[PDB]
Amino acid sequence: ARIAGINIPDHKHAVIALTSIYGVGKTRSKAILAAAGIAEDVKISELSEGQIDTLRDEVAKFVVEGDLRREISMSIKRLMDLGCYRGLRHRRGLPVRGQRTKTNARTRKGPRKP
């Protein structure tokens, strides 16, 4: 219940609880469970510490919370320092992937200023 430096919840199925790891989604979660040999429909509380630390060293094969967070931070900082178009978009807080900016882009833009 303390995998990858975080505290994934019990009383949840294993597929659902593993997704609480930053860097593990549904696909990676079920892959971790299939490598560990654990049924997806079992609760983390219903596991034995051998099952949990096999889960741990199986998640170890993936870049996760701190590692992945700093990886993404370096990607974005690389773009911003390079000064490419995407870097300038990240700087100015505008859409990066060519989306509409005339009317939408509230997610990338924040709420309306005036």
Binding site: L82, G83, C84, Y85
Partner: protein, 82 residues
């Protein structure tokens, strides 16, 4: 992006220009209009002036600007605020 089985993309005029530059000096800004050409590793240290629509923006190529296209460093639109 450009598929892997087709290789990267560069215009031949820019290719020949950067060959001649990497063979014979790193002095002049290579004036190019090919914003669509991928930046190759043999272009590092060059000072390629890429057309942005009305000027040629000088781009000093680094090894970090490799997987990219020349246009990403010549912003075409001007915006200072509202």
């Amino acid at each position: 992006p450009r598929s892997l089985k087709k290789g990267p993309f560069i215009d031949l005029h820019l290719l020949k220009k950067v060959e001649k530059a990497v063979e014979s000096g790193d002095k002049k800004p290579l004036r190019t209009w090919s914003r669509r050409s991928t930046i190759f590793p043999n272009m590092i240290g060059l000072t390629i002036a890429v057309h942005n629509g009305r000027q040629h923006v000088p781009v000093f190529v680094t090894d970090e600007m490799v997987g990219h296209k020349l246009g990403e460093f010549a912003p075409t639109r001007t915006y200072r605020g509202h």
